[PDB]
Amino acid sequence: HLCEFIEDCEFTVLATRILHLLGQEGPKTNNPSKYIRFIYNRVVLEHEEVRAGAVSALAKFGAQNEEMLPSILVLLKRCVMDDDNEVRDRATFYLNVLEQKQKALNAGYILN
Amino acid sequence: KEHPAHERVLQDLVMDILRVLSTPDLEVRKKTLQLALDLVSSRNVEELVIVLKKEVIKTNNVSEHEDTDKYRQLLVRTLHSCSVRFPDMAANVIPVLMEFLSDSNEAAAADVLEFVREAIQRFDNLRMLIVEKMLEVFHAIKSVKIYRGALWILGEYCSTK
């Protein structure tokens, strides 16, 4: 309900809060395809900023992986990628950051 | 124009004609600009450029742009193209300056466009000055646009360690 409605019940501000929370929660509650499905959408919206949250939430999530995620988790960041300079940069950088640590290690430091 | 035997001169006479444009009507003007761009094998250029600069001054003036603004953007496009081909010069520096003066996004977008481009183009030298120029501009200024500007530039970085 939240997901859907909020989508078409708007307000960016809400998203900030919820994002943050969601950010922690991920794969302890599974339903991956859906959740992904959502996540993509959330990003769908413009705003470098709106887009950005899906990646950040993801870090706790990614790290944990779910009912299918690690392989693919690795595949995805690749599949979804962006320019728009500082938006480019965000993709690049997260990557670059990613680039910079053994992704397993990477996850551990950053997450905390 | 498909008199592709296309004589030198003719291209050249344009400016004269173009002068008339100062008695505006953008829409007409606009048609001109496209038209204009074409002839230049990166030449009859300077005289023009100069003239452009004249335009530029003219553009300053006191203005109450409403139509001409548009023109400016266009001009810049028209202008942009040339440069690609060309080796260009001080004139260009001036845009940079000019741009600093200005206050609306579309230009920033162009600028940015330039950011991109230039990032590709790198013969560099100019940039550095400009970067300086910019440094001034920057010091000299505040805004989201700027704020954004900083970001990329910052991103860019080099010397004066």
From Swiss-Prot, chain A:
Location within or outside the cell: Cytoplasm, Cytosol; Golgi apparatus membrane; Cytoplasmic vesicle, COPI-coated vesicle membrane
> What is known about what this protein does?
The coatomer is a cytosolic protein complex that binds to dilysine motifs and reversibly associates with Golgi non-clathrin-coated vesicles, which further mediate biosynthetic protein transport from the ER, via the Golgi up to the trans Golgi network. Coatomer complex is required for budding from Golgi membranes, and is essential for the retrograde Golgi-to-ER transport of dilysine-tagged proteins.
Family membership, please give it. Belongs to the COPG family.
The UniProt subunit note reads as follows:
Oligomeric complex that consists of at least the alpha, beta, beta', gamma, delta, epsilon and zeta subunits. Interacts with ZNF289/ARFGAP2 through its C-terminal appendage domain. Interacts with EGFR upon EGF treatment; interaction is essential for regulation of EGF-dependent nuclear transport of EGFR by retrograde trafficking from the Golgi to the ER. The coatomer interacts with KDEL receptors; the interaction is important for retrograde trafficking of KDEL-bearing proteins from the Golgi to the endoplasmic reticulum. Interacts with COPB1. Interacts with TMED10 (via C-terminus).
Protein name, UniProt field: Coatomer subunit gamma-1
Organism placement in taxonomy? Eukaryota, Metazoa, Chordata, Craniata, Vertebrata
Q: Which gene encodes it?
A: Copg1
Swiss-Prot record, chain B:
This molecule's function is given as: The coatomer is a cytosolic protein complex that binds to dilysine motifs and reversibly associates with Golgi non-clathrin-coated vesicles, which further mediate biosynthetic protein transport from the ER, via the Golgi up to the trans Golgi network. Coatomer complex is required for budding from Golgi membranes, and is essential for the retrograde Golgi-to-ER transport of dilysine-tagged proteins.
Included stretch of the parent chain? 309 to 469 of 953
Q: In which tissues is it expressed?
A: Predominantly expressed in the upper one-third of the oxyntic mucosa and in most regions of the pyloric mucosa. Ubiquitously expressed including platelet, liver, heart, spleen, lung and kidney.
Question: What is the species listed in this Swiss-Prot or TrEMBL entry?
Answer: Mus musculus (Mouse)
The gene name on file is Copb1
Quaternary state and partners of this protein?
Oligomeric complex that consists of at least the alpha, beta, beta', gamma, delta, epsilon and zeta subunits. Interacts with CAPN8. Interacts with SCYL1 and PRKCE. Interacts with COPG1. Interacts with ARF1 (myristoylated); this interaction is required for binding of COPB1 to Golgi membranes. Interacts (via trunk domain) with ARF1 (via switch I region); the interaction is direct. Interacts with KCNK2 (via N-terminus); this interaction increases the channel-mediated whole cell currents and promotes plasma membrane expression of KCNK2. Interacts with STX17. Interacts with TMEM115.
Region forming the signal peptide: none
Q: Where in the cell is it found?
A: Cytoplasm; Golgi apparatus membrane; Cytoplasmic vesicle, COPI-coated vesicle membrane; Cell membrane
Q: What is the protein's name according to its record?
A: Coatomer subunit beta
> Which top-rank group of organisms is this from?
Eukaryota
Further information in the entry reads: Brefeldin A induces dissociation from the Golgi of the beta-COP and presumably the other coatomer subunits.
HEAT repeats span which residues? 8-45, 88-125
